[PDB]
Design a protein around this ligand. Structure first.
Ligand SMILES: NC(=O)c1ccc[n+]([C@@H]2O[C@H](COP(=O)([O-])OP(=O)(O)OC[C@H]3O[C@@H](n4cnc5c(N)ncnc54)[C@H](O)[C@@H]3O)[C@@H](O)[C@H]2O)c1
Ligand SMILES: Cc1cc2nc3c(=O)[nH]c(=O)nc-3n(C[C@H](O)[C@H](O)[C@H](O)COP(=O)(O)O)c2cc1C
Ligand code: SF4
Ligand code: FES
Ligand code: NA
Lengths: 155, 417
């Protein structure tokens, strides 16, 4: 396994950013997940060598941080807040709307590997409850018609 | 120029300080910031000694805005009594339920935070500063990276800033899903490229922190106050709010309120005034049942007349106000709090590891009416026993809010029996 030049250049940028190379691990993994739509198990060994860390160290970091998924490839990750304010304002209405549009429940991936619903803890946008993210973009769920239109922007 | 989509959180101020620009839901770049007299407090600070700045921040009575309210000047004083090099850390992990006060400074007025970091780093002799921002704030991350480059371009960062001989680089690090990484020692481990595991304290970061060196960790909101103390002098800053709990404070209000959002108010405002005078009262004008101070405290409708300050009888915490009305099931809400702690324990400490898991697992059984009599008794016991041997605040409070609901709403818990 070898990282594509376009990704390897981005990883080298994060590694040369902090005063110590090992400080770039999270930025590198975020970049790997942006590129592949998940964390491919094969990417860990060349990353460990680029960070000058043992593979075991990298494995434990990937296991610890919940944003990282080494299981399911998905072009778009629909992060649905399942915490207190969003539960109070309509998480279940948002999840019902998502099941109706995409046919999937939290933890599942659409057959085309396009969308994955990821249940998450409070996203820090509680005044806009129920909150959801579609990759890096964040929105207040209003209704199924509204959510349908938002999801249509992701091709 | 282009950033990920971010919801337009409503923000209102009576003080026009922290939300002077951030009351408008948009990025304010360096030209806009400079037009408001931005970076002039830094210019003034670079003409002062690090020692004078500490004295001013001390005398302002600024206390930590992260939730614990530690006196900021006092924190800096502990760090500078230790030999260098020293590090300055801005805590932008904001992951407490109902808490969204910091993100509106980061995303709308990033130069207010940056200027505060430069003044603070100069005051403690730190030539290397960090912003650790939660991974679920990607727009905030790109906004800060862009604002930092603008500051460097205007000569506010880099070597020998404005001919003062003071050097400073600010590095922006991202979190990756862990609430515990906002705990200042877990944040330092994450900044070191490791798992977010809290360290035994003492030592406090100010004695031994990043790479074992004296480190100051301050919340976004605390740091956003530093340009105001330097700009107006500590005395005029102390005129804001009560003299014992001075300055502006951000109140992230959510739940069953007509106007949810961030309110910049003085700390002598009462909890009832925050909900009814500022947040427009309740949705459907339904009676307030409880107020959750994040995932930390639960206040009943009988406790709304308390001040929003760091006093023993005051609201305290982050100033987070989650409003529950008469139709909200307190046990269903407690279950949400139990599920939060279950998901966030780092599991280093056995009673926290097992206690957070069991509290959520038993509370679910109780809620679904699948709990045995032993399950009810075990739930009561586990809740009173998460804290033993804990080395961070998470294990110390994981049962706090839930215990308060048990004591304040016994009738509702009793029907689940
Ligand atoms: N804002 C958020 O999103 C968020 C999320 C979770 C928790 N929290 C808050 O975290 C708080 C608990 O934080 P904590 O465990 O850091 O609390 P703490 O009271 O132990 O300490 C607060 C600060 O003071 C410093 N300090 C305390 N005693 C000191 C001493 N003897 N010498 C030097 N420095 C000293 C600490 O190092 C820390 O920086 C809670 O009240 C909660 O509201 C906030
Ligand atoms: C589990 C846990 C999570 C925390 N998360 C945050 C956070 O996201 N942001 C924050 O500023 N403080 C947070 N804190 C508090 C910090 O440890 C620390 O008190 C604070 O950052 C110091 O800054 P301040 O004095 O300006 O408040 C957390 C504490 C604990 C126990
Ligand atoms: S109290 Fe809990 S969260 Fe804190 S260090 Fe111990 S196991 Fe981790
Ligand atoms: S509870 Fe969902 S964004 Fe805070
Ligand atoms: Na985090």
């Amino acid at each position: 396994f070898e990282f594509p030049e376009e990704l390897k250049t981005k990883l080298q940028e994060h590694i040369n950013y902090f005063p110590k190379k090992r400080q770039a691990i999270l930025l590198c993994l975020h970049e790997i997940q942006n590129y592949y739509g998940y964390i491919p198990p094969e990417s860990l060994k060349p990353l460990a060598d680029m960070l000058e860390l043992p593979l075991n160290h990298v494995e434990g970091v990937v296991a610890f941080y919940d944003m990282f998924d080494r299981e399911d490839k998905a072009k778009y990750r629909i992060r649905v807040c399942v915490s207190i304010v969003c539960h109070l304002m309509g998480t279940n209405k948002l999840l019902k709307a998502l099941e109706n549009i995409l046919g999937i429940k939290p933890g599942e991936v659409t057959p085309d590997g396009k969308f994955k619903i990821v249940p998450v803890q409070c996203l820090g946008a509680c005044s806009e409850a129920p909150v959801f993210m579609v990759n890096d973009d964040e929105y207040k769920f209003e209704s199924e018609v509204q959510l349908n239109e938002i999801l249509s922007r992701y091709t | 120029r282009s950033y990920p989509a971010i919801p337009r959180i409503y923000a209102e101020t009576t003080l026009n300080m922290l939300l002077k620009r951030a009351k408008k839901p948009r990025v304010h770049s360096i030209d806009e910031y400079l037009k408001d007299g931005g970076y002039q407090a830094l210019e003034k600070a670079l003409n002062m000694s690090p020692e004078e700045i500490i004295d001013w921040v001390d005398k302002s009575t600024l206390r930590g805005r992260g939730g614990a309210g530690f006196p900021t000047g006092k924190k800096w004083k502990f760090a500078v009594q230790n030999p260098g090099p020293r590090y300055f850390i801005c805590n932008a992990d904001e992951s407490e339920p109902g808490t969204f006060k910091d993100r509106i400074i980061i995303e709308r007025d990033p130069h207010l935070l940056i200027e505060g970091i430069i003044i603070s780093s100069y005051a403690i002799g730190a030539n290397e500063a960090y912003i650790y921002i939660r991974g679920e704030y990607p727009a905030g991350y790109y906004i800060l990276r862009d604002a930092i480059e603008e500051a460097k371009k205007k000569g506010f960062l880099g070597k020998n800033i404005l001919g003062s001989g003071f050097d400073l680089e600010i590095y922006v690090a991202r979190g990756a899903g862990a609430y515990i990484c906002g705990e200042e020692t877990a944040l330092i481990e994450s900044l070191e490229g490791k798992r977010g595991h809290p360290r035994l304290k003492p030592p406090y970061p100010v004695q031994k922190g990043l790479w074992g060196k004296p480190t100051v960790v301050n919340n976004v909101e605390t740091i956003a106050n530093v340009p105001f103390i330097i700009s107006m002098g500590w005395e005029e800053y102390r005129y804001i709010g009560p003299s014992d709990y001075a300055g502006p404070k951000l109140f992230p209000v959510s739940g069953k309120v007509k106007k949810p959002g961030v309110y910049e108010l003085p700390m002598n405002t009462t909890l009832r005034e925050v909900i009814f005078k500022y947040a427009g009262g309740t949705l459907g004008n339904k009676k307030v049942k409880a107020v959750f101070s994040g995932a930390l405290d639960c206040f009943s409708s009988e406790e709304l007349d308390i001040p929003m300050d760091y006093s023993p009888l005051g609201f305290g915490g982050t100033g987070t106000v989650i409003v529950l009305t008469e139709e909200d099931d307190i046990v269903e809400a407690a279950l949400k709090i139990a599920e939060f702690y279950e998901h966030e324990t780092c599991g280093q400490c056995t009673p926290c590891r097992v206690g957070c898991y069991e509290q959520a697992n038993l509370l679910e059984k109780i809620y679904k009416g699948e709990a045995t009599e032993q399950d009810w008794e075990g739930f009561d016991f586990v809740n009173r026993n998460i804290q033993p041997t804990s080395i961070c605040g998470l294990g110390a409070v994981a049962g706090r809010l839930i215990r308060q609901t048990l004591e304040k709403f016994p009738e509702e818990w009793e029907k689940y029996r």
